[PDB]
Structure 1
Amino acid sequence: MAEKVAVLLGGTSAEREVSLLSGQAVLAGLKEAGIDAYGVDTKDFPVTQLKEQGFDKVFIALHGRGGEDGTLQGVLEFLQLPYTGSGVMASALTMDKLRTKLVWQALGLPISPYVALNRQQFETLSPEELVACVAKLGLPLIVKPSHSVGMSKVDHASELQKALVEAFQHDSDVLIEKWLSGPEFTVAILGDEVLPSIRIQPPGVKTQYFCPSGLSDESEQQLAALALQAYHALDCSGWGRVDVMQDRDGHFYLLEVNTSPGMTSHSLVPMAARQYGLSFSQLVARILMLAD
Structure 2
Amino acid sequence: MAEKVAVLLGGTSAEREVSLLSGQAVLAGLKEAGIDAYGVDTKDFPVTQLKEQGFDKVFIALHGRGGEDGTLQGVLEFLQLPYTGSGVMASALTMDKLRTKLVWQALGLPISPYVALNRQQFETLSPEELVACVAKLGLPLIVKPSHVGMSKVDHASELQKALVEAFQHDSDVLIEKWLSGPEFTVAILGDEVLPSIRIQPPGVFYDYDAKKTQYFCPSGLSDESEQQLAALALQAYHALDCSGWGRVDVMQDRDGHFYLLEVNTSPGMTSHSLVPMAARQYGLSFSQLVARILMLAD
TM-score range, shorter chain: over 0.9
How many residues align? The count is 291
Segments of 4+ in structure 1 off by > 2 A? none
- Are 1:277 and 2:283 an aligned pair? yes
Deviation track 1:101-124 (CA, whole Å, cap 9, x = no partner) reads: 000000000000000000000000
Distance 1:117 1:103 in 2: 17
* Structure 1 residue 239: Cα displacement: 0.1
* Structure 1 residue 53: Cα displacement: 0.2
Distance 1:153 1:45 in 2: 41
Which residues of 2 match residues 144-223 of structure 1 at below 5 A?
A: 144-147=144-147, 149-204=148-203, 206-223=212-229
Structure 2 unaligned regions, length at least 5: 205-211
- Are 1:123 and 2:129 an aligned pair? no
Deviation track 1:255-277 (CA, whole Å, cap 9, x = no partner) reads: 00000000000000000000000
State the TM-score, normalizing by the size of structure 1. Answer: 0.99
1:114 alignment counterpart: 114
Sequence identity (%): 100
* Structure 1 residue 73: Cα displacement: 0.1
2:88 alignment counterpart: 88
* Structure 1 residue 51: Cα displacement: 0.1
Q: What is the root-mean-square deviation in Å for CA atoms of aligned residues?
A: 0.7
* Structure 1 residue 135: Cα displacement: 0.3
2:208 alignment counterpart: none
Larger deviation: 240-249 or 196-205? 196-205
Deviation track 1:108-146 (CA, whole Å, cap 9, x = no partner) reads: 000000000000000000000000000000000000000
Distance 1:204 1:284 in 2: 32
* Structure 1 residue 285: Cα displacement: 0.1
Could you say what secondary structure the match of 1:223 adopts?
Answer: helix
State the TM-score, normalizing by the size of structure 2. Answer: 0.97
Return the match for 2:248 from 242, 248, 261. Answer: 242
Deviation track 1:225-263 (CA, whole Å, cap 9, x = no partner) reads: 000000000000000000000000000000000000000
Structure 1 unaligned regions, length at least 5: none
Distance 2:202 2:151 in 1: 17
Could you say what secondary structure the match of 2:234 adopts?
Answer: helix
* Structure 1 residue 161: Cα displacement: 0.5
Deviation track 1:158-212 (CA, whole Å, cap 9, x = no partner) reads: 0000100000000000000000000000000000000000000001491010000
Distance 2:17 2:135 in 1: 42
